[PDB]
Motif scaffolding. Structure first.
Motif, PDB file in Angstrom:
ATOM      1  N   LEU A   1       5.570 -35.554   5.939  1.00  0.00           N
ATOM      2  CA  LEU A   1       4.491 -34.944   5.171  1.00  0.00           C
ATOM      3  C   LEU A   1       3.898 -35.934   4.181  1.00  0.00           C
ATOM      4  CD1 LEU A   1       5.732 -31.304   4.548  1.00  0.00           C
ATOM      5  CD2 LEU A   1       3.795 -32.076   5.920  1.00  0.00           C
ATOM      6  N   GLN A   2       4.747 -36.707   3.504  1.00  0.00           N
ATOM      7  CA  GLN A   2       4.235 -37.756   2.632  1.00  0.00           C
ATOM      8  C   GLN A   2       3.427 -38.772   3.425  1.00  0.00           C
ATOM      9  OE1 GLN A   2       8.523 -37.886   1.437  1.00  0.00           O
ATOM     10  NE2 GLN A   2       7.654 -38.810  -0.414  1.00  0.00           N
TER      11      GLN A   2
ATOM     12  N   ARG B   1       0.049 -37.641   3.961  1.00  0.00           N
ATOM     13  CA  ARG B   1      -0.736 -37.533   2.737  1.00  0.00           C
ATOM     14  C   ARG B   1      -1.304 -38.881   2.312  1.00  0.00           C
ATOM     15  NH1 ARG B   1      -1.349 -38.056  -2.961  1.00  0.00           N
ATOM     16  NH2 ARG B   1      -1.630 -36.021  -3.972  1.00  0.00           N
ATOM     17  N   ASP B   2      -0.489 -39.939   2.344  1.00  0.00           N
ATOM     18  CA  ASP B   2      -1.009 -41.261   2.008  1.00  0.00           C
ATOM     19  C   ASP B   2      -2.032 -41.723   3.035  1.00  0.00           C
ATOM     20  OD1 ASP B   2       1.403 -41.236   0.184  1.00  0.00           O
ATOM     21  OD2 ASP B   2       2.421 -41.705   2.071  1.00  0.00           O
TER      22      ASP B   2
ATOM     23  N   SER C   1      -3.946 -39.809   4.942  1.00  0.00           N
ATOM     24  CA  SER C   1      -5.169 -39.034   4.757  1.00  0.00           C
ATOM     25  C   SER C   1      -5.982 -39.569   3.588  1.00  0.00           C
ATOM     26  CB  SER C   1      -4.834 -37.559   4.545  1.00  0.00           C
ATOM     27  OG  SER C   1      -4.204 -37.010   5.687  1.00  0.00           O
TER      28      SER C   1
ATOM     29  N   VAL D   1      -0.965 -26.869   8.406  1.00  0.00           N
ATOM     30  CA  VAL D   1      -0.739 -28.250   8.819  1.00  0.00           C
ATOM     31  C   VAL D   1      -1.032 -28.423  10.304  1.00  0.00           C
ATOM     32  CG1 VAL D   1       0.857 -30.180   8.656  1.00  0.00           C
ATOM     33  CG2 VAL D   1       1.019 -28.295   7.039  1.00  0.00           C
TER      34      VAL D   1
ATOM     35  N   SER E   1      -7.310 -32.199   3.979  1.00  0.00           N
ATOM     36  CA  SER E   1      -5.956 -32.339   4.503  1.00  0.00           C
ATOM     37  C   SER E   1      -4.951 -32.670   3.412  1.00  0.00           C
ATOM     38  CB  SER E   1      -5.913 -33.410   5.592  1.00  0.00           C
ATOM     39  OG  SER E   1      -6.820 -34.458   5.326  1.00  0.00           O
ATOM     40  N   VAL E   2      -5.295 -33.579   2.498  1.00  0.00           N
ATOM     41  CA  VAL E   2      -4.352 -33.963   1.451  1.00  0.00           C
ATOM     42  C   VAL E   2      -4.014 -32.769   0.568  1.00  0.00           C
ATOM     43  CG1 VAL E   2      -6.316 -34.862   0.195  1.00  0.00           C
ATOM     44  CG2 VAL E   2      -4.027 -35.415  -0.567  1.00  0.00           C
TER      45      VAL E   2
ATOM     46  N   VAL F   1      -1.546 -30.841   2.638  1.00  0.00           N
ATOM     47  CA  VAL F   1      -0.248 -31.505   2.675  1.00  0.00           C
ATOM     48  C   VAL F   1       0.504 -31.291   1.370  1.00  0.00           C
ATOM     49  CG1 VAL F   1       0.917 -33.692   2.937  1.00  0.00           C
ATOM     50  CG2 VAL F   1      -1.053 -33.184   4.347  1.00  0.00           C
ATOM     51  N   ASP F   2      -0.197 -31.370   0.238  1.00  0.00           N
ATOM     52  CA  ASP F   2       0.462 -31.166  -1.047  1.00  0.00           C
ATOM     53  C   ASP F   2       1.056 -29.768  -1.143  1.00  0.00           C
ATOM     54  OD1 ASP F   2      -0.563 -33.329  -3.594  1.00  0.00           O
ATOM     55  OD2 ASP F   2       1.131 -31.951  -3.808  1.00  0.00           O
TER      56      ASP F   2
ATOM     57  N   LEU G   1       4.143 -29.830   1.001  1.00  0.00           N
ATOM     58  CA  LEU G   1       5.227 -30.546   0.339  1.00  0.00           C
ATOM     59  C   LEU G   1       5.869 -29.690  -0.742  1.00  0.00           C
ATOM     60  CD1 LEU G   1       3.699 -34.084   0.263  1.00  0.00           C
ATOM     61  CD2 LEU G   1       6.141 -33.704   0.596  1.00  0.00           C
TER      62      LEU G   1
END
Lengths: 54, 270, 53, 54, 53, 53, 54
Positions: free
Chosen positions: B35-36, B39-40, B42, B222, B236-237, B240-241, B244
Motif C-alpha cells: 500500500l505504501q 502511494r509513493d 501514485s 483500492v 488514488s493517494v 491509499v491513505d 493504510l
C-alpha cells in the motif's frame, strides 16, 4: 516458550532479516559501479520509460 | 486435577490463538508495504511532467500490485483455514480450565475491493482554469458530515480571496483532516471521504459550493483504484491513505489481542 | 508465513526439553521407589511362614 | 510438607521463569537483526500507527 | 522536513543497540541461571527417595 | 544472460550457509541428545536385575 | 488515541476475565462472591481465622 531443538524461530528470524539486508546490499554495489540508480525495470517502472525517452 | 489438566490444555489453545494472530500479522506487514508502494508511486504519477505513456506504465505496475493484495488475501491459510479472505468469522478461543470463558477474535476481510478499504468521492461539475480566482462574497464553503464517532459534524471553510483553484485545495486539506481535495486537469475538485470513519453521504453548501459543482457520492476502493490521468493520481493517494489507516487500525487490534493472550499465559501458569 | 507456521509447529509437535526431562526424572525415581517396594514386600510371605517351623 | 516425587513445585517455578526469560530473549535477537524495536503490532500498537504515518 | 521526520522515525520505530544489547545479555544470564536452577531442582525428589532405599 | 543464469545457478545448486549451518547444529544437538538417551536406556535392564541379587 | 483506546478496552476485558476465571477448583476467588471464609486451625472448634478477598 517451549525450549526445543527441532525448531529455531529466532534463527529463522535472523536469517530472514539477513537476506533482507544482503539483497539491498546486493541491490547496491551494482548501482555504484554502473553509476545508474535505474538499470533494471524492477527499480522504477516510470523512471525507465522517461529515462529511455530522455 | 481436572483444573490442572484443563489449564494445561488452556495454555495450548491460547498459544494457538497467538500463532493465528501473528500469522495474520505476517501478511499484515506485506499488505502495508504494498500500500505504501502504491502511494509513493501514485505521487510520482501525479506529476505534470510525465506523459500518458509513463502513466500507463504506472497503471500496469499498479494493477500488478493490485493482484497481489487479492492474492495474499486468499493465500494466507494457516493449515487450510483462510485468515484474510473474510471467510474467517468470529472464532472464540477457550482459554480457561472451565467452559464459557472464551475470547472472540474477528479478522476483517482485506480484499482490495473491500468497502472499508476505500471511501466516497465527489467531483466538481465545472472546472476553473489558471486565471480564475476566488471572488469576494463567494468564499463560504460549509460541509455537512456524518461521522462514526462524534457524528453530525459541520465544518465551514472560508477560502482566502484571490486564491486560485489549486491552492484552494491545499487550504481545504490544511483546515481539516476529514476531507481531502485536489484538482485534476481543469479545476474540478475531487473531495474524498474515508469510508471507515465518515460513513454516510456528505452535503455541500455555501456560496463557493454553488460556484463549483456539488457532485454525487461515488464509491471507490483500492480494486477500482485506477491512475491513468493525474486526476485519478490525486484520487488514488487519498484512497491509499484511507486503506493504510484501515490496515493499521486492524493491525493494532490484533496486537492488543496478542498482548491480552501473552498476559493470559503467565496468568494461567501462575 | 513460513516463519510463523513453523512457530505453530512447536508445542504442537515439538517437545520442550525442560518440562519433559523433569517428567522423565520423576518417573525414574518413581520406578526406583516402586521397585524397592517390591523388594521389601518379598519378605512378607517369609515372615508369614516363620510363625510355625 | 511433602517430600514426594509426583509434584515438583520448585521445578514448575523454574519452568515459568525460564519461559519468561527466553520469551523476552526471543523478543530480542530480532530487534537487533531487523534494526527496529517496532516490527509487530504487539510490541506497541500506538507506536506502529504513528511510525507508519511518519 | 524530511530530515526531521526521519529523526522522528527513530526511537519510535528504530531500536538502539545501546540498551537493547544489555536487555539481551541480561536475558541470557537470566535464562542460564534459571536453567541451572532446574539442574538442582531435579534431584529434590531423588533425595526424598534416598531416606528409604 | 551469463550473469543472470549464474544467479539462477544458485539456490537450486549452490547451497547457503545461513540455514545450512543451523541445520548442521540442530543435527549435532540431536545426535548428542539421543546418544545420551542410550546412557539412560542401558541401565533399564540393570534395574530389572536389581530386584533380585 | 483510538488505537490506544483499543488496547485499553482490550486489557479491560482481561481484568473482567481473570476476576471471573481464578477458581481454585470451582470457587470464585476474585469474582467477589467469595465472602469471609473461616479456616479452622486449632485442635478444638471455635479457634478459626477469618479471611476475605475483595
Amino acid at each position: 516458550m517451549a525450549v526445543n531443538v527441532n525448531t529455531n524461530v529466532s534463527a529463522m528470524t535472523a536469517q530472514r532479516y539477513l537476506t533482507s539486508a544482503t539483497n539491498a546490499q546486493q541491490s547496491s554495489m551494482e548501482r555504484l559501479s554502473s553509476g545508474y540508480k535505474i538499470n533494471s525495470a524492477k527499480d522504477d517502472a516510470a523512471g525507465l520509460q522517461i529515462s529511455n525517452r530522455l | 486435577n481436572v483444573q490442572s489438566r484443563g489449564l494445561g490444555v488452556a495454555v495450548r489453545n491460547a498459544n494457538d490463538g497467538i500463532s493465528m494472530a501473528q500469522t495474520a500479522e505476517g501478511a499484515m506487514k506485506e499488505t502495508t508495504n504494498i500500500l505504501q508502494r502504491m502511494r509513493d508511486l501514485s505521487l510520482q504519477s501525479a506529476n505534470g511532467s510525465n506523459s500518458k505513456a509513463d502513466r500507463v506504465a504506472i497503471q500496469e505496475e499498479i494493477t500488478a500490485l493490485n493482484d497481489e493484495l487479492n492474492r495474499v488475501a486468499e493465500t494466507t491459510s494457516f493449515g487450510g483455514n483462510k485468515l484474510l479472505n473474510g471467510t474467517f468469522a468470529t472464532k472464540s478461543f477457550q482459554i480457561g480450565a472451565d467452559n464459557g470463558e472464551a475470547v472472540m477474535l474477528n479478522i476483517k476481510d482485506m480484499r482490495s475491493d473491500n468497502a472499508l478499504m476505500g471511501g466516497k468521492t465527489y467531483q466538481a461539475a465545472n472546472g476553473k482554469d489558471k486565471n480564475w480566482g476566488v471572488e469576494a462574497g463567494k468564499t463560504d464553503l460549509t460541509i455537512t458530515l456524518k461521522d462514526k464517532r462524534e457524528g453530525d459534524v459541520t465544518i465551514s471553510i472560508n477560502a482566502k480571496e484571490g486564491d486560485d483553484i489549486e491552492e484552494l485545495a491545499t487550504y481545504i486539506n490544511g483546515q481539516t483532516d476529514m476531507i481531502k481535495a485536489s484538482v485534476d486537469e481543469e479545476g474540478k475538485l475531487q473531495l474524498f471521504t474515508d469510508n471507515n470513519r465518515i460513513d454516510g453521504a456528505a452535503t455541500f453548501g455555501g456560496a463557493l459550493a454553488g460556484e463549483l459543482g456539488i457532485g454525487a457520492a461515488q464509491d471507490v476502493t483500492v480494486d477500482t483504484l485506477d491512475v491513468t490521468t493525474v486526476g485519478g493520481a490525486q484520487e488514488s493517494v487519498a484512497i491509499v491513505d484511507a486503506a493504510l489507516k484501515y490496515v493499521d487500525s486492524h493491525r493494532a487490534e490484533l496486537g492488543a489481542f496478542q498482548n491480552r493472550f501473552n498476559h493470559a499465559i503467565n496468568n494461567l501458569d501462575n | 508465513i513460513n516463519e510463523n507456521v513453523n512457530a505453530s509447529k512447536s508445542r504442537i509437535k515439538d517437545t520442550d526439553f525442560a518440562k519433559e526431562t523433569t517428567a522423565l526424572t520423576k518417573a525414574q525415581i518413581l520406578s526406583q521407589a516402586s521397585s524397592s517396594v517390591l523388594a521389601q514386600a518379598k519378605q512378607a510371605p517369609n515372615s508369614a511362614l516363620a510363625l510355625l517351623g
